[PDB]
């Protein structure tokens, strides 16, 4: 397939005999790739679970939002710590989580019951799901929990841990409400004190070793990996390779794994725009994470080929048609010229022909006019003369 232009019309139609006609084909084949890895300046030594431990576990009605900023974080250790009972990660793979970067990590520590991490999930039912700690439906992050019966309990349990089960409205996502207000359930008002049909809406947990597993203590840290339009402050162990420009390889830039040819750019950004998009929301240009240099992505391995041929009944001499490539030694770069020989004859040499339909190299150009037997496009026609 990867030897002649005739040899790759012969693969796109799955027949060893072609006919006479213009044959729009497929891939230009071979294209050797390697890898480019670029990920920024980093602070190192990160607040892991080794600062999210020991004593002072945060309250379930009074948690905080631990602002983890610039660090490198090996996320494989937190998966392979082998002490945590439930991971369920939301659009992110837990195993290959270390091959990504984010702008910040939002950890939220609180202790709940044993039947409630089926409710700490996006869009769940129940009271303490929607009245105590709400998650968005399009959440991009994990949930981490484990039994803490021998650490989060005393004799008779803690009266410091208070879930809220009554509130007039449901919570917004990630919302905190640290109020200690009495709520009213019935006709007789409360007005700051208790009494008939007044319920105290915070509720103390019962933490005993004789108590049930579904009410056992169970701290939950929820890691929100959000992706803003800031530079990536938090990353993982992605040791960095160089920056080779042109020669199409697979790459990864701030977690955006793609494959393309890397060129210098003429394009202007903002202070913190790491990614430039497209009309149909793909990738056109990426800010380099290290040197803050503009780059440009374009696909390789294609030009617009339509091999014209007189058929294999006549001869094996063919000619090509690139579509928007204007052949001023540009399909040295369009057709990425690292292919095997007996293609480079039909790329740049003699028999260069400029047409509105793009360039046709490998055939004659004749100042006379004749008939059409193999139509090409934009007012030209070839044939086969002996």
């Amino acid at each position, epitope marked *: 397939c990867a030897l002649d232009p005739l040899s790759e019309t012969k693969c796109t139609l799955k027949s060893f005999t072609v006919e006479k006609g213009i044959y729009q084909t497929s891939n230009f084949r071979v294209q050797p790739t390697e890898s480019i890895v670029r990920f920024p300046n980093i602070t190192n030594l990160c607040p892991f679970g080794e600062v999210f431990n020991a004593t002072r576990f945060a309250s379930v009605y009074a948690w905080n939002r631990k602002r983890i900023s610039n660090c490198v974080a090996d996320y494989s250790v937190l998966y392979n710590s082998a002490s945590f009972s439930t991971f369920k990660c939301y659009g992110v793979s837990p195993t290959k989580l270390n091959d990504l970067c984010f702008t910040n990590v939002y950890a939220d520590s609180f202790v709940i019951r044993g039947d409630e991490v089926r409710q700490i999930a996006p869009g769940q039912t129940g009271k303490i799901a929607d009245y105590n700690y709400k998650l968005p439906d399009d959440f991009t992050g994990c949930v981490i929990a484990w039994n803490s019966n021998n650490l989060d309990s005393k004799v008779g349990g803690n009266y410091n841990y208070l879930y809220r089960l009554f509130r007039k409205s449901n919570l917004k996502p990630f919302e905190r409400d640290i109020s200690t207000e009495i709520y009213q359930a019935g006709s007789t008002p409360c007005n700051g004190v208790e009494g008939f049909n007044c319920y105290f809406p915070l509720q103390s947990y019962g933490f005993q070793p004789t108590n049930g597993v579904g009410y056992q203590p169970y701290r939950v840290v929820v890691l929100s990996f959000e992706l803003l339009h800031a530079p990536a402050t938090v990353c993982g162990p992605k040791k960095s390779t160089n920056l080779v420009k042109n020669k199409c390889v697979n790459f990864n830039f701030n977690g955006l794994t793609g494959t393309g040819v890397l060129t210098e750019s*003429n394009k*202007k950004f*903002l*202070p913190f725009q790491q*990614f*430039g*998009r497209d*009309i149909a*929301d793909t990738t056109d240009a990426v800010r380099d994470p290290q040197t803050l240099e503009i780059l440009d992505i374009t696909p390789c391995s294609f030009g617009g080929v339509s091999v014209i041929t007189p058929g294999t009944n006549t001869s094996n001499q063919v000619a090509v048609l690139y579509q928007d490539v204007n052949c001023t030694e540009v399909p040295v770069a369009i057709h990425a010229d690292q292919l095997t020989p007996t293609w480079r004859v039909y790329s740049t040499g003699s028999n260069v022909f400029q047409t509105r339909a793009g360039c046709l190299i490998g055939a004659e150009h004749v100042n006379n006019s004749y008939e059409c037997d193999i139509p090409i496009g934009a007012g030209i026609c070839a044939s086969y003369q002996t």
Partner: antibody
Amino acid sequence: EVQLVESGGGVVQPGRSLRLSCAASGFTFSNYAMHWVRQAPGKGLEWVAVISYDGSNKYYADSVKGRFTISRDNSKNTLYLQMNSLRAEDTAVYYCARENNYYDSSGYSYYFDYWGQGTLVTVS
Amino acid sequence: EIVLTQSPGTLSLSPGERATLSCRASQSVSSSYLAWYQQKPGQAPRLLIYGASSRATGIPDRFSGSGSGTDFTLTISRLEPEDFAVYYCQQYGSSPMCSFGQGTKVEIK
């Protein structure tokens, strides 16, 4: 030459809607980022908004966010600023500006190379 | 959030000498991500200094600015009559925001 010809001014009653247009010529409009820039009479000048070359990266100012919105269309080389619910303190001259970035090895410099001609928008 | 402060609000000097304008921030502005502009009165602003040190195209060497940290200056020696306009300091790095100062108009004494 480069031209950022803009239009959309006049006298508009409060609470109505408007759509300022910054047409561009002389360069590639999808190669550069875009800026909306405003000036009250008798004061200094107050920044409004920024959108990128593609539209995926928008930012607005603190007294701007919500009502004002920004968009672009690259096929006609035009920048769009859409006005919802106008208030009498928004009597200002509006300007479209482009962001040209002189790169260096020690950083990344930022400036406003080319501007519009100013469109007066009065809210009364 | 960086607010930008200038002093004075309007300066009046005779033509031919040096004109001194000052700009002041709220934080430590890193690597001078600011610029200086000329709003001719009634007209659009026109860029003079970029990076608080380097002149633009069509902009002579009589305008010269410098600064670091917080206090930022502009010095215009030999005052031609086309140089009397309103000048600004304008940040754009550090935050995603763009913030202006209140500026100074240069007049005739």
